[PDB]
């Protein structure tokens, strides 16, 4: 079944585009009353499998991440929408960071810093809420056209632990871009656990690496398996990071032993001022949050909010 075929049975969501077919999900862009939406359609080949376990999880991710301004959970889920398919619904964002890195205008250092700041803010938001994103990747970091980061596609249905012996489990659930990139924390490799906050910190650290290397992946599956065994360290790619302090944050976060990986809030404490401008904590995160989530401010009213606040904005950012 083609990705579009599934939408023939649905009235409320009109097919728009395909984002990419993989044996795990077929992803389409759909037009909706509210805007554009990503529909991850899961062809449920074996009806014996209980999707009720995944539907519960996603409904508690949806509740916990309701107020997480930089997290975008799946907002809907439908076990039988096409009888042989399930579907996960979330808004569609302007960019995904992997593409944004290449689209113009190119991200400045200060914009990359703002994206890495908000990646750590998103991880911190979900982690405080009680949620883990079991695969952060640049594809899953989403960027509004005002550079609000939304972390999306929370990997609650993906396995926390993978065997190193059989790459079949990685190939199915992870690396749907088919880039062979591997940000799966090394201790997630063995030979239905719970996901750990340090398993996101390795994933997030590698995404900040790739962000600051202009898309050079820090590891692929063999390199992560070597790093897991201590036979490789990505010094070459880390030296493509142009900023020493983001380089050390990444080198901290990708640390091999999870015990040495702090909380996202700690990296944001340590990085105050030095990696992340003070103004990110004091003005831009709280000011920009008024545009962010379940907010209702029109393009016409956005410009009037920013015009009416120009003087205040100039003082905070500039002085």
């Amino acid at each position: 079944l083609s990705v579009e075929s599934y939408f023939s049975d649905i009235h409320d969501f009109e097919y728009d585009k395909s984002l990419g077919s993989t044996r795990f999900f077929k992803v389409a862009r759909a037009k909706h009353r509210e805007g554009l939406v990503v529909v991850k359609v899961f062809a449920i080949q074996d009806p014996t499998l209980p999707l009720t376990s995944y539907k519960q999880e996603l409904e508690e991710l949806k509740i916990r991440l309701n107020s997480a301004q930089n997290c975008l959970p799946f907002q809907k889920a439908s076990e039988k929408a096409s009888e042989k398919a399930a579907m996960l619904f979330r808004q569609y964002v302007r960019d995904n960071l992997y593409d944004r890195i290449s689209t113009r205008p190119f991200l400045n250092n200060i914009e990359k810093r703002w994206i890495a700041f908000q990646i750590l803010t998103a991880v911190d938001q979900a982690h405080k809420s009680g949620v883990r994103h079991g695969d952060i990747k640049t594809e899953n970091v989403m960027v509004t056209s005002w550079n609000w980061v939304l972390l999306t596609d929370f990997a609650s249905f993906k396995p926390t632990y993978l065997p190193e012996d059989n790459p079949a489990d990685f190939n199915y659930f992870f690396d749907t871009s088919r880039r062979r990139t591997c940000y799966i924390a090394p201790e997630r490799f063995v030979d239905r656990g719970e996901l750990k906050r340090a398993m996101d910190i390795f994933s997030a650290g590698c995404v900040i690496a790739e962000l600051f290397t202009e898309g050079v992946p820090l590891f692929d599956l063999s390199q992560l398996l070597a790093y897991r065994n201590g036979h490789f360290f990505p010094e070459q790619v880390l030296n493509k990071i142009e900023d020493h302090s983001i380089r050390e944050l990444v080198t901290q976060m990708i640390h091999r032993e999870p015990d040495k990986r702090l909380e996202a809030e700690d990296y944001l404490k340590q990085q105050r001022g030095n990696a992340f401008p003070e103004i990110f904590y004091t003005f831009l995160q709280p000011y920009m949050a008024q545009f962010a989530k379940e907010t209702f401010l029109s393009a016409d009213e956005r410009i009037l909010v920013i015009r009416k606040d120009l003087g205040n904005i100039i003082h905070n950012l500039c002085g």
């Binding site: 009353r33 509210e34 805007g35 808004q91 056209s145 005002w146």
Partner: protein, 267 residues
């Protein structure tokens, strides 16, 4: 008995014609002839104040919005004055009704000769083009003239053209027929207004520039020009749903203009 009460109007953004302003008469006296100042400045005897009772003054009309001029000033054509300043000239302004924002004003400056190649402002006056509820001013208006200054086009203007102030309005309303007529009472009351007016003539050296605005007529109807913007009826289809799309993006399905600028410069 009377034509109906229907109020006809045109949107300002639909009336694509030049604004025209009649410069009527300049009533009032000038600043006498201070011969103290002439001893200090001998060039001052060679100025319209000191050469004729009515120098051949001219007015410049310029439209301002947000403190900026919308176009160049328009000058009254030369008219030789002997005993009264009465241009009686319709000036076609370089601005059209669609071009006028809600805070458009006309800054009117009366100019006089001050020696060779030098005009001095006799006075200035500024009046907003739309009224209190956004209707273009209609008919004959008498504007307070501020002595020895140019009309100020800044927002708010320092030379607004708008006892005798209140009475004149009532008098205009009476002459138009909006006030009820009571002959025995009008006869008595207007003598008092005349006394008030004469007292103000002697008390103050005020000048008034009477101007007029054109009347828009079609089939013997009167249309007021109300300020509007095209699409002003487009009440945005705002809806309060956030079931899936929690974070609206205004640039969502829009051409990337920074990539097209780049395409146009590389390719």
């Amino acid at each position: 008995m009377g034509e109906a009460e229907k109020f006809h109007y045109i949107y300002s953004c639909d009336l694509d014609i030049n604004v025209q302003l009649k410069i009527g008469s300049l009533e009032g006296k000038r600043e006498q002839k201070s011969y103290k100042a002439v001893l200090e400045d001998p060039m001052l005897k060679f100025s319209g104040l000191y050469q004729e009772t009515c120098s051949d003054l001219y007015v410049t009309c310029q439209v301002f919005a947000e403190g900026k001029p919308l176009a160049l000033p328009v000058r009254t054509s030369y008219k030789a004055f002997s005993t009264r300043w009465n241009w009686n000239e319709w000036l076609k302004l370089p601005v059209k009704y669609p071009d006028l924002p809600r805070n458009a004003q006309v800054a009117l400056t009366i100019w006089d000769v001050y020696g060779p190649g030098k005009a001095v402002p006799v006075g200035g006056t500024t009046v907003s083009l739309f009224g209190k509820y956004g209707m273009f001013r209609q008919g004959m208006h008498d504007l307070k003239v501020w002595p020895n200054v140019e009309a100020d086009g800044s927002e708010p203007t320092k030379t607004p053209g708008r006892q005798m102030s209140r009475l004149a309005k009532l008098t205009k309303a009476h002459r138009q027929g909006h006030m009820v007529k009571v002959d025995w009472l009008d006869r008595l009351t207007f003598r008092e207004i005349e006394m008030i007016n004469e007292s103000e003539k002697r008390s103050s050296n005020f000048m008034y520039l009477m101007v007029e605005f054109r009347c828009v007529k079609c089939d013997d109807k009167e249309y007021g020009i109300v300020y509007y913007e095209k699409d002003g009826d487009e009440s945005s289809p705002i809806l309060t749903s956030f079931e899936l799309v929690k974070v609206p993006d205004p640039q969502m399905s829009m051409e990337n203009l920074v990539e097209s600028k780049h395409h146009k410069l590389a390719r």
